[PDB]
Amino acid sequence: DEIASLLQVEHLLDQRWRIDPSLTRISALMDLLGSPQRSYPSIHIAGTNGKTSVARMVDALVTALHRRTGRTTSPHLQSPVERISIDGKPISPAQYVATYREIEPLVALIDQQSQASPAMSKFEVLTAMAFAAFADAPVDVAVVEVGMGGRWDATNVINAPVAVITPISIDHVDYLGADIAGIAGEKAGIITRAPSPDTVAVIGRQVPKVMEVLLAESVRADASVAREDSEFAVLRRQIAVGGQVLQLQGLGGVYSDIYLPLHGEHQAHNAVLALASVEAFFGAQLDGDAVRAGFAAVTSPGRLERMRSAPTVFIDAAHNPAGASALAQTLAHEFDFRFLVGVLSVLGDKDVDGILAALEPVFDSVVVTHNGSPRALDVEALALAAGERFGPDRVRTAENLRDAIDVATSLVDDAAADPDVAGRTGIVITGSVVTAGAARTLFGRDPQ
Ligand SMILES: Nc1ncnc2c1ncn2[C@@H]1O[C@H](COP(=O)(O)OP(=O)(O)O)[C@@H](O)[C@H]1O
Ligand SMILES: [Co+2]
Ligand SMILES: [Co+2]
Ligand SMILES: [Co+2]
Ligand SMILES: [Co+2]
Ligand SMILES: [Mg+2]
C-alpha cells in the first residue's frame, strides 16, 4: 500500500507534463512554503555528463565528513523515490507520498493562481518536494542536481554557495549546428552572486569556447573559480579490482590511495571535481581518511554497473556521444572482452548516430529494441540507424527489453561455443536512462 500510494501520486504528477524561464511558479510556491530551500546551504550541479555521478560523490564525501545530507538527482532509473535522498539513501515510498501531500494544497493554489493570472510541471513539483523534505529532515547540506540547463531550471532558486559545472557537450538535439556558447551560458546561470563568502564555481574539463563563457559568467557573479587542471587535477590513476585507485590534487593538497569502486577514466574526473567542490564548500586540507572513506562508499547505479558475470552484463545510462564514447573506452581499456553484444534503446531527441558511432568499435553486434518510454525511438527507426553504422549483419531487433536480452544472450552463448571467438563475453545494455533503469529492475536490484 506504500507502493500503491506512491503509484497514485505518480499517476497525478504524470498528468501535468509551459516553460517558465522567469521561475515565477516555483518561486511563488517556495514563498508559500516558507522558503525551505533557503534554510540550508546547497552545492548545485550543472553540466552535460557526470552530474548525477558527481552529485552522489559529493553526498558520499559530505557524509564521510559526518554532515547530514539531502540530495536531489534526476532523472530516476527505477523509482521516483531515487530523486530525493537523505543521509545517502532514497526516502521511502511512504515519505515520498507524505511529502507530496504536505505541499499539495500550496501546489494547488499556485496551479489555480497561475491558470487565473499553465499548471506547475512535474519537475517543479518534484523539486519543491525535495526542498521541503530537506527542511523536514532537516539536513546540514543539500546536494542539488539541475533538471536541465541551469539558468531557468526549477532548482535555480537556491543561490548556492558552491556551483559545479561538469563537462559540457551535446545531449538534447534541437539543431544540426551547435550553439556551444549558448549552451554554456544557460548552465552558467546557476553561478549566482552571494548575499557571506563569494560563490565558488568549480569547473570540470571544458572546450575553450565553453570555458570562456563560464569564466565570463563567473566574473559577472563575483564568483571565485577553481578549474580542473589548474586548481585541482587527477595526478595518477591505476585500474584495480572493482574500479580504480587514484591520486588526486584537490584545493587543499594531494590525497593518495583513493579507491573508487567505479569503472572509467571519466569517473576519475568526476571524483576530483566532487572533491574540489566539497573542499570549496568547507573552505579547504580535509581529513584524508574521510576523503578515502567517502570515495570508497560511492555508488552510481546504472553507470557502467555490472548486473552479473558469466556472462558479464553491464547496464549504462549513456545517451549522448560523450557518454557512449566514455562507455566504449572503458569497455576496451579496463576489461578484456573477446565478444560484446549491445542491447540498445534510445530516446528520439538524442544524437542517435553519434551514440552508435562511438559504440560500433566495441560492440561486435547490437540488438535494438524499445525501452517502453513514449519518447523512445521506434525499433525500425533505431534498427536502420544502427544498420548505417554497423552494417545490417551486426544488427538484430527485439520487440521489448526482455526479449532483447534473451537475443543478446543467445549471441553470447554462440560466441562462447565458437572456438576462434570466445570458445570473456558480455552484454551491454545502454542508450538511455530508461533502458538502464528498466534493465536494473529486470535484474531485481532495489532502487539506490
Ligand atoms: N565526466 C563524464 N564524461 C563522459 N561521460 C560521462 C561522465 N560522467 C558520466 N558519464 C557517462 O554519462 C552517463 C550518465 O552519467 P550521469 O553521471 O548520470 O550524468 P548526468 O547526470 O549528467 O546525466 C553515464 O552512464 C556514463 O556513460
Ligand atoms: Co543526472
Ligand atoms: Co528541444
Ligand atoms: Co588514519
Ligand atoms: Co569460428
Ligand atoms: Mg543527459
mmCIF file of all heavy atoms in Angstrom, residues 289-320:
data_model
loop_
_atom_site.group_PDB
_atom_site.id
_atom_site.type_symbol
_atom_site.label_atom_id
_atom_site.label_comp_id
_atom_site.label_asym_id
_atom_site.label_seq_id
_atom_site.Cartn_x
_atom_site.Cartn_y
_atom_site.Cartn_z
ATOM 1 N N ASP A 289 41.606 10.412 5.556
ATOM 2 C CA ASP A 289 40.849 9.170 5.831
ATOM 3 C C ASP A 289 39.376 9.349 5.489
ATOM 4 O O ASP A 289 38.733 8.405 5.030
ATOM 5 C CB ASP A 289 40.961 8.766 7.312
ATOM 6 C CG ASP A 289 42.368 8.319 7.687
ATOM 7 O OD1 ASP A 289 43.234 8.197 6.775
ATOM 8 O OD2 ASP A 289 42.644 8.064 8.876
ATOM 9 N N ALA A 290 38.818 10.540 5.753
ATOM 10 C CA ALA A 290 37.399 10.741 5.456
ATOM 11 C C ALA A 290 37.194 10.816 3.927
ATOM 12 O O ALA A 290 36.208 10.297 3.340
ATOM 13 C CB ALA A 290 36.907 12.048 6.136
ATOM 14 N N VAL A 291 38.138 11.469 3.242
ATOM 15 C CA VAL A 291 38.055 11.501 1.773
ATOM 16 C C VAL A 291 38.160 10.048 1.211
ATOM 17 O O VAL A 291 37.415 9.692 0.329
ATOM 18 C CB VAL A 291 39.173 12.354 1.193
ATOM 19 C CG1 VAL A 291 39.354 12.122 -0.323
ATOM 20 C CG2 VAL A 291 39.001 13.902 1.614
ATOM 21 N N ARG A 292 39.129 9.250 1.668
ATOM 22 C CA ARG A 292 39.223 7.863 1.198
ATOM 23 C C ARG A 292 37.938 7.091 1.496
ATOM 24 O O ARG A 292 37.430 6.366 0.620
ATOM 25 C CB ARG A 292 40.391 7.159 1.835
ATOM 26 C CG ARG A 292 41.684 7.433 1.091
ATOM 27 C CD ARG A 292 42.945 6.756 1.694
ATOM 28 N NE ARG A 292 43.345 7.375 2.975
ATOM 29 C CZ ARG A 292 44.052 8.509 3.073
ATOM 30 N NH1 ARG A 292 44.447 9.182 1.973
ATOM 31 N NH2 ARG A 292 44.347 9.005 4.281
ATOM 32 N N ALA A 293 37.429 7.241 2.716
ATOM 33 C CA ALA A 293 36.165 6.537 3.113
ATOM 34 C C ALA A 293 34.947 6.983 2.276
ATOM 35 O O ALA A 293 34.108 6.137 1.917
ATOM 36 C CB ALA A 293 35.902 6.670 4.638
ATOM 37 N N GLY A 294 34.827 8.282 1.948
ATOM 38 C CA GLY A 294 33.696 8.745 1.166
ATOM 39 C C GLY A 294 33.734 8.188 -0.241
ATOM 40 O O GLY A 294 32.731 7.662 -0.763
ATOM 41 N N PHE A 295 34.906 8.247 -0.858
ATOM 42 C CA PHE A 295 35.028 7.684 -2.220
ATOM 43 C C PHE A 295 34.798 6.180 -2.266
ATOM 44 O O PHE A 295 34.125 5.696 -3.176
ATOM 45 C CB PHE A 295 36.385 8.046 -2.830
ATOM 46 C CG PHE A 295 36.396 9.422 -3.409
ATOM 47 C CD1 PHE A 295 37.365 10.369 -3.002
ATOM 48 C CD2 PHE A 295 35.437 9.788 -4.333
ATOM 49 C CE1 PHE A 295 37.384 11.666 -3.575
ATOM 50 C CE2 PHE A 295 35.404 11.090 -4.874
ATOM 51 C CZ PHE A 295 36.422 11.997 -4.538
ATOM 52 N N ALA A 296 35.288 5.457 -1.249
ATOM 53 C CA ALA A 296 35.092 4.048 -1.201
ATOM 54 C C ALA A 296 33.638 3.700 -1.058
ATOM 55 O O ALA A 296 33.230 2.592 -1.439
ATOM 56 C CB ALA A 296 35.888 3.412 -0.066
ATOM 57 N N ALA A 297 32.844 4.603 -0.500
ATOM 58 C CA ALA A 297 31.436 4.271 -0.326
ATOM 59 C C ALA A 297 30.563 4.712 -1.525
ATOM 60 O O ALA A 297 29.359 4.475 -1.509
ATOM 61 C CB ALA A 297 30.907 4.948 0.935
ATOM 62 N N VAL A 298 31.156 5.334 -2.551
ATOM 63 C CA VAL A 298 30.353 5.863 -3.675
ATOM 64 C C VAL A 298 29.659 4.739 -4.409
ATOM 65 O O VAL A 298 30.313 3.737 -4.713
ATOM 66 C CB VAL A 298 31.301 6.538 -4.734
ATOM 67 C CG1 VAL A 298 30.565 6.808 -6.059
ATOM 68 C CG2 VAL A 298 31.851 7.824 -4.126
ATOM 69 N N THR A 299 28.390 4.941 -4.789
ATOM 70 C CA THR A 299 27.744 4.069 -5.818
ATOM 71 C C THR A 299 27.238 4.993 -6.909
ATOM 72 O O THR A 299 27.040 6.219 -6.683
ATOM 73 C CB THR A 299 26.582 3.234 -5.282
ATOM 74 O OG1 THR A 299 25.636 4.140 -4.705
ATOM 75 C CG2 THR A 299 27.054 2.264 -4.199
ATOM 76 N N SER A 300 27.116 4.472 -8.133
ATOM 77 C CA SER A 300 26.407 5.252 -9.172
ATOM 78 C C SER A 300 25.606 4.233 -10.020
ATOM 79 O O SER A 300 26.070 3.749 -11.030
ATOM 80 C CB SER A 300 27.380 6.061 -10.020
ATOM 81 O OG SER A 300 26.651 7.015 -10.826
ATOM 82 N N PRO A 301 24.425 3.864 -9.538
ATOM 83 C CA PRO A 301 23.629 2.832 -10.148
ATOM 84 C C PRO A 301 23.384 3.183 -11.612
ATOM 85 O O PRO A 301 23.226 4.339 -11.964
ATOM 86 C CB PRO A 301 22.321 2.847 -9.395
ATOM 87 C CG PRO A 301 22.551 3.787 -8.127
ATOM 88 C CD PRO A 301 23.807 4.513 -8.350
ATOM 89 N N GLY A 302 23.425 2.162 -12.443
ATOM 90 C CA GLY A 302 23.188 2.342 -13.881
ATOM 91 C C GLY A 302 24.281 3.087 -14.595
ATOM 92 O O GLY A 302 24.077 3.437 -15.751
ATOM 93 N N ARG A 303 25.439 3.369 -13.958
ATOM 94 C CA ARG A 303 26.625 3.901 -14.698
ATOM 95 C C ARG A 303 27.728 2.833 -14.717
ATOM 96 O O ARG A 303 28.413 2.570 -13.701
ATOM 97 C CB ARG A 303 27.163 5.216 -14.095
ATOM 98 C CG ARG A 303 26.268 6.453 -14.434
ATOM 99 C CD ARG A 303 24.831 6.213 -14.024
ATOM 100 N NE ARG A 303 23.974 7.403 -14.099
ATOM 101 C CZ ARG A 303 22.680 7.436 -13.746
ATOM 102 N NH1 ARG A 303 22.036 6.359 -13.296
ATOM 103 N NH2 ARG A 303 21.998 8.561 -13.856
ATOM 104 N N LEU A 304 27.832 2.164 -15.865
ATOM 105 C CA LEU A 304 28.711 1.030 -16.048
ATOM 106 C C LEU A 304 28.635 0.087 -14.855
ATOM 107 O O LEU A 304 29.657 -0.242 -14.218
ATOM 108 C CB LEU A 304 30.137 1.521 -16.216
ATOM 109 C CG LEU A 304 31.007 1.229 -17.456
ATOM 110 C CD1 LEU A 304 30.501 0.238 -18.444
ATOM 111 C CD2 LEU A 304 31.492 2.555 -18.032
ATOM 112 N N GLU A 305 27.413 -0.309 -14.520
ATOM 113 C CA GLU A 305 27.187 -1.106 -13.341
ATOM 114 C C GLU A 305 27.002 -2.566 -13.786
ATOM 115 O O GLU A 305 26.194 -2.862 -14.664
ATOM 116 C CB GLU A 305 25.927 -0.619 -12.595
ATOM 117 C CG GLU A 305 25.715 -1.335 -11.255
ATOM 118 C CD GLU A 305 24.408 -0.936 -10.594
ATOM 119 O OE1 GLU A 305 23.573 -0.301 -11.283
ATOM 120 O OE2 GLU A 305 24.184 -1.295 -9.416
ATOM 121 N N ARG A 306 27.719 -3.477 -13.162
ATOM 122 C CA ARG A 306 27.643 -4.897 -13.522
ATOM 123 C C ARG A 306 26.513 -5.565 -12.807
ATOM 124 O O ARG A 306 26.464 -5.524 -11.557
ATOM 125 C CB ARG A 306 28.907 -5.585 -13.045
ATOM 126 C CG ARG A 306 30.007 -5.609 -14.054
ATOM 127 C CD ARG A 306 31.010 -6.784 -13.774
ATOM 128 N NE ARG A 306 31.446 -6.906 -12.366
ATOM 129 C CZ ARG A 306 32.029 -7.993 -11.850
ATOM 130 N NH1 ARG A 306 32.313 -9.058 -12.634
ATOM 131 N NH2 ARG A 306 32.356 -8.024 -10.562
ATOM 132 N N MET A 307 25.626 -6.193 -13.583
ATOM 133 C CA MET A 307 24.486 -6.925 -13.033
ATOM 134 C C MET A 307 24.860 -8.369 -12.704
ATOM 135 O O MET A 307 24.226 -8.973 -11.817
ATOM 136 C CB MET A 307 23.295 -6.988 -14.028
ATOM 137 C CG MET A 307 22.675 -5.640 -14.379
ATOM 138 S SD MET A 307 21.817 -4.843 -12.858
ATOM 139 C CE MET A 307 23.335 -3.773 -12.218
ATOM 140 N N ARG A 308 25.844 -8.929 -13.414
ATOM 141 C CA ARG A 308 26.293 -10.273 -13.118
ATOM 142 C C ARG A 308 27.567 -10.552 -13.928
ATOM 143 O O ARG A 308 27.973 -9.705 -14.733
ATOM 144 C CB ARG A 308 25.233 -11.308 -13.570
ATOM 145 C CG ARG A 308 24.950 -11.258 -15.117
ATOM 146 C CD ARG A 308 24.164 -12.523 -15.669
ATOM 147 N NE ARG A 308 24.988 -13.699 -15.403
ATOM 148 C CZ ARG A 308 24.720 -14.593 -14.472
ATOM 149 N NH1 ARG A 308 23.571 -14.482 -13.797
ATOM 150 N NH2 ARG A 308 25.560 -15.632 -14.281
ATOM 151 N N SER A 309 28.182 -11.722 -13.737
ATOM 152 C CA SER A 309 29.342 -12.119 -14.541
ATOM 153 C C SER A 309 28.966 -13.499 -15.137
ATOM 154 O O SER A 309 27.938 -14.072 -14.719
ATOM 155 C CB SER A 309 30.608 -12.157 -13.651
ATOM 156 O OG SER A 309 30.597 -13.207 -12.662
ATOM 157 N N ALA A 310 29.747 -14.013 -16.114
ATOM 158 C CA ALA A 310 29.468 -15.316 -16.751
ATOM 159 C C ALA A 310 28.022 -15.488 -17.240
ATOM 160 O O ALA A 310 27.294 -16.318 -16.704
ATOM 161 C CB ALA A 310 29.802 -16.447 -15.836
ATOM 162 N N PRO A 311 27.605 -14.745 -18.253
ATOM 163 C CA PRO A 311 28.334 -13.705 -18.980
ATOM 164 C C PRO A 311 28.248 -12.423 -18.141
ATOM 165 O O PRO A 311 27.336 -12.297 -17.313
ATOM 166 C CB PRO A 311 27.487 -13.525 -20.247
ATOM 167 C CG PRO A 311 26.077 -13.773 -19.781
ATOM 168 C CD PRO A 311 26.222 -14.927 -18.760
ATOM 169 N N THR A 312 29.163 -11.493 -18.350
ATOM 170 C CA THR A 312 29.047 -10.183 -17.774
ATOM 171 C C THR A 312 27.920 -9.391 -18.448
ATOM 172 O O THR A 312 27.814 -9.372 -19.655
ATOM 173 C CB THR A 312 30.364 -9.415 -17.932
ATOM 174 O OG1 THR A 312 31.390 -10.133 -17.216
ATOM 175 C CG2 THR A 312 30.201 -8.003 -17.395
ATOM 176 N N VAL A 313 27.065 -8.772 -17.653
ATOM 177 C CA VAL A 313 26.040 -7.868 -18.165
ATOM 178 C C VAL A 313 26.304 -6.548 -17.458
ATOM 179 O O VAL A 313 26.366 -6.482 -16.201
ATOM 180 C CB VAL A 313 24.636 -8.322 -17.800
ATOM 181 C CG1 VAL A 313 23.586 -7.218 -18.208
ATOM 182 C CG2 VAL A 313 24.323 -9.725 -18.446
ATOM 183 N N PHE A 314 26.467 -5.509 -18.278
ATOM 184 C CA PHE A 314 26.552 -4.148 -17.757
ATOM 185 C C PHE A 314 25.296 -3.426 -18.088
ATOM 186 O O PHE A 314 24.690 -3.685 -19.145
ATOM 187 C CB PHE A 314 27.630 -3.374 -18.493
ATOM 188 C CG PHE A 314 29.002 -3.710 -18.048
ATOM 189 C CD1 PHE A 314 29.786 -4.603 -18.780
ATOM 190 C CD2 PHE A 314 29.529 -3.117 -16.934
ATOM 191 C CE1 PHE A 314 31.075 -4.876 -18.360
ATOM 192 C CE2 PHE A 314 30.841 -3.416 -16.521
ATOM 193 C CZ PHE A 314 31.589 -4.272 -17.271
ATOM 194 N N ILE A 315 24.938 -2.466 -17.244
ATOM 195 C CA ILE A 315 23.956 -1.501 -17.656
ATOM 196 C C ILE A 315 24.648 -0.154 -17.578
ATOM 197 O O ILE A 315 25.478 0.076 -16.670
ATOM 198 C CB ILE A 315 22.688 -1.488 -16.735
ATOM 199 C CG1 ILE A 315 23.078 -1.141 -15.255
ATOM 200 C CG2 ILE A 315 21.865 -2.808 -16.911
ATOM 201 C CD1 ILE A 315 21.829 -0.985 -14.280
ATOM 202 N N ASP A 316 24.283 0.739 -18.501
ATOM 203 C CA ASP A 316 24.854 2.056 -18.566
ATOM 204 C C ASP A 316 23.860 3.041 -19.171
ATOM 205 O O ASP A 316 23.276 2.786 -20.242
ATOM 206 C CB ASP A 316 26.177 2.066 -19.335
ATOM 207 C CG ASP A 316 26.931 3.402 -19.130
ATOM 208 O OD1 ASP A 316 27.578 3.626 -18.104
ATOM 209 O OD2 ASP A 316 26.795 4.282 -19.946
ATOM 210 N N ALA A 317 23.676 4.180 -18.504
ATOM 211 C CA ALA A 317 22.713 5.184 -18.898
ATOM 212 C C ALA A 317 23.173 6.024 -20.127
ATOM 213 O O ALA A 317 22.434 6.948 -20.523
ATOM 214 C CB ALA A 317 22.453 6.141 -17.718
ATOM 215 N N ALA A 318 24.347 5.747 -20.708
ATOM 216 C CA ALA A 318 24.848 6.585 -21.805
ATOM 217 C C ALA A 318 23.745 6.906 -22.812
ATOM 218 O O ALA A 318 23.066 6.016 -23.313
ATOM 219 C CB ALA A 318 26.010 5.913 -22.513
ATOM 220 N N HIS A 319 23.588 8.186 -23.118
ATOM 221 C CA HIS A 319 22.524 8.623 -24.014
ATOM 222 C C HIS A 319 22.977 9.877 -24.808
ATOM 223 O O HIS A 319 22.133 10.678 -25.307
ATOM 224 C CB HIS A 319 21.240 8.925 -23.249
ATOM 225 C CG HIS A 319 21.406 9.984 -22.228
ATOM 226 N ND1 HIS A 319 21.614 9.696 -20.898
ATOM 227 C CD2 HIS A 319 21.438 11.330 -22.334
ATOM 228 C CE1 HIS A 319 21.725 10.822 -20.223
ATOM 229 N NE2 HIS A 319 21.623 11.825 -21.068
ATOM 230 N N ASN A 320 24.299 10.025 -24.948
ATOM 231 C CA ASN A 320 24.822 11.055 -25.836
ATOM 232 C C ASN A 320 26.222 10.611 -26.310
ATOM 233 O O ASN A 320 26.771 9.638 -25.801
ATOM 234 C CB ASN A 320 24.852 12.452 -25.165
ATOM 235 C CG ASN A 320 25.969 12.566 -24.050
ATOM 236 O OD1 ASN A 320 26.420 11.564 -23.543
ATOM 237 N ND2 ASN A 320 26.428 13.767 -23.748
#
